[PDB]
Amino acid sequence: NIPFTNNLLFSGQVLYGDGRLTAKNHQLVMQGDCNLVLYGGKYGWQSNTHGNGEHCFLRLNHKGELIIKDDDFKTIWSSSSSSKQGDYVLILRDDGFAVIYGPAIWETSPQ
Amino acid sequence: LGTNYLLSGQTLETEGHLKNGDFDLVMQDDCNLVLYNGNWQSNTANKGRDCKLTLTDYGELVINNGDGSTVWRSKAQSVKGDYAAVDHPEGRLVVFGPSVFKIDPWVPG
Asked: Cβ–Cβ of A99/B59 closer than 8 Å?
């Protein structure tokens, strides 16, 4: 498991049951009612999926797509952003935008 | 600037840092970029003063000294777009991009 960072969600990590990303003035919450909501200014946003499943969770995969699944793995919502295979990250940025970047193209390695 | 990421078009200045857990990436006054506890550095100590780290819109990290000269770059490039260099909690700086999906809370509905 990858350790959690408040403003990030890496490929493989999951949120559920009111787990959320947090940054300056904003929260992106995978709520216990199956709706994914971005709280804070101006308008906010939602996936609009209240009551559509039980025990839903959010997961980012290794093609840059974010999926909401219910407990039986039925798709409730997709970002429809599938792309090249690799490691991705969802950043809830300090300016309020939640953005999926990837794949990873370069990294530091112990020397 | 974000605590633990640098975006395409942003600058980490001299003495600036990204931090996640025990890992601390510093653009030092000696022009060396050092990832504390990550066993990594740009190895650019004394190659300038007033050095700054940037990230290009091709996903390349670049250190420049105080009179605009490029002292180090990451070499890997990909398509044109928006990138983010993120300090991963396992202790690595990773360049991710381009961006592929955006949620925008500033506009309707």
From this structure: no
